[PDB]
Design a protein around this ligand. Structure first.
Ligand SMILES: Nc1nccc2c1ncn2[C@@H]1O[C@H](CO)[C@@H](O)[C@H]1O
Ligand SMILES: Nc1nccc2c1ncn2[C@@H]1O[C@H](CO)[C@@H](O)[C@H]1O
Ligand SMILES: [Ca+2]
Ligand SMILES: [Ca+2]
Lengths: 319, 322
């Protein structure tokens, strides 16, 4: 049967496509909850879009409602405000504002806005009968908060943490006048938390760094294929989000969520991953460490691109 | 009976909302052509989005096809590289890429690709048995070319020019290190062409400067109402384009939409006659639309106190035409 999955995201466009993938593959994934972080989005918008997507799907296909929580995590190095506003735009898109669907969200909103994201992640993981796979598409602040507070009690409950983040053998994507371009954004947002997660013993981590995600870019011809499926709400939703990315833009979080759905997406290789926490040009960089007895992270490599793109197009036909 | 109308735009998000407004109101308007200018968009993209929207409406509400041409016009002062890229994102929207509509467009794209934007505008107006109303939502370069090239043979055929542009009694929106913020972007893109248009006698002009567009901003509650009409392709279309405009600041308005709304129904706003000249000298206020003292100076009818509720209701209704 399907495995338990919690999505820990920061509400940008690819975070939502990742959400769709997880929630539309009911045979492989049982999405038991989600949390949104005020990183690459303003959490109130990220929170509402999460809920609106969950209700549109729930009212049109097989998908049990699940808890959604706002994480109190705060930034160390914030995302450029320009990219963050994207959840706001999504929040106003017609396909996410069908009355019957918004109506549902309005009735269940009170319950969900009561949860605190980090504590909800700890609870969903620990109180689960089966182990829980965590799909992290935003910064690692939340998995770190759980580790710092419950240690082995939390980590022993995690099936595996499938993380979108870092740059191992390729350049990063954090280009500011104070950085050298070796770091990737999710790690850079909160380096200390990333260090805690990558250096945590007894936690299995799958890592989709820029090494894998650079090989699956957002391309117009493929994006137009969603036009062949306008009869499906999800194809209108997914095609519309990627239309705002194509112009530089990758399916970062989507590919990552695709792996949680089906491991065929990519093979993973063991690498001791440490994180630069100092205020230097390479702050947030993910580097190999040969330090004695350091935990091994399984880096994804050479992703099956066609397999992924096909998985997404077909999944966007769930409803 | 509908009146002939040609849309002269530059492919930004409101230009396309304006296009839908014009085309969807077939009772009041018969859209006989459109041209895209490489201004606040990249012409090729503006061109295809224009064609995909036309075809989609053709196969869903019987909107007669019409020639679409690319303007050869070039900038004097380029639009910010940031905004121009939007006609690009719209080109990949699922709603504009339905196979049947893409097929039709791919068929007729070669012949429309043949037209020269400026000449197309001249011919559509001069070869019409009835006069033609021109809706300009981009720079004034194309109407100016036609005036210069054909003069009275052209203007005498123009019912009226309804233009989105300028700022008369309020500040502009062009803020660069070298400007003073008094000019508006469409005029600033090509001041000389604008001067030509506003000074031309024998041509009737309706002007939607920021004075009127400032009074009808893009707000979330309203945009979300398009979600009440997802069974209409045009509501998915218009609702998505404006969803991209809901950003602290004032940001986006419905500049080009309000302008086309007037072409559909003059009830949209009252107009005031004002002699308008354009600053073409490379001064800080370059591109500013100013009141001139010249004698016998042709008057331009500036929009005042637009009916905001009337407009919002017109757009929501027009979007349910299919
Ligand atoms: N323009 C952009 N550049 C880099 C990263 C971006 C981005 N827009 C969103 N992201 C996010 O940053 C993380 C990838 O570096 C992803 O999880 C993704 O959501
Ligand atoms: N952010 C922005 N600021 C100013 C003008 C803008 C804009 N985005 C688009 N425009 C365009 O500017 C002209 C309005 O000033 C309109 O025709 C419209 O298409
Ligand atoms: Ca993300
Ligand atoms: Ca325009």
């Amino acid at each position: 049967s399907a495995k338990n999955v919690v999505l820990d995201h920061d509400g940008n466009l690819d975070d939502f496509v990742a959400m769709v993938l997880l929630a539309s593959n009911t045979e492989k994934v049982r999405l038991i909850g989600a949390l949104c972080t005020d990183a690459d989005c303003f959490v109130e918008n990220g929170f509402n879009v999460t809920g609106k997507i969950m209700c549109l799907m729930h009212n049109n296909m097989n998908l049990p409602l699940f808890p959604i929580g706002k994480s109190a995590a705060t930034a160390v190095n914030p995302f450029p405000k320009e990219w963050r506003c994207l959840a706001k735009n999504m929040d106003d898109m017609p396909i996410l504002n069908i009355p019957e669907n918004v109506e549902l969200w309005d009735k269940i909103k009170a319950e969900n806005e009561k949860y605190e994201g980090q504590q909800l992640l700890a609870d969903l993981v620990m109180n689960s009968e089966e182990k829980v796979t965590i799909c992290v598409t935003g910064p690692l602040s939340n998995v770190a908060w759980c580790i710092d507070k419950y240690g082995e009690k939390f980590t022993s409950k995690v099936e595996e943490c499938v993380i979108m983040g870092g740059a191992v053998d390729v350049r990063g994507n954090v280009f500011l006048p104070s950085t050298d371009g070796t770091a990737e954004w999710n790690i850079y947002w909160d380096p200390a938390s990333a260090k805690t997660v990558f250096g945590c013993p007894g936690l299995r981590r799958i890592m989709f760094s820029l090494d894998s995600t650079n090989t699956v870019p957002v391309r117009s011809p493929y994006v137009q294929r969603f036009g062949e499926q306008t009869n499906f709400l999800l194809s209108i939703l997914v095609g519309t989000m990627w239309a705002m990315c194509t112009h530089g833009y990758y399916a970062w979080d989507a590919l990552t969520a695709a792996y949680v759905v089906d491991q065929k997406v990519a093979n993973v290789d063991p690498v001791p991953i440490d994180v630069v926490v100092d205020k230097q040009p390479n702050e947030g960089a993910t580097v190999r460490t040969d330090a004695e007895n350091y935990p091994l992270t399984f880096v994804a490599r050479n992703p099956e691109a066609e397999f992924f793109l096909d998985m997404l197009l077909r999944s966007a036909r769930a409803c």
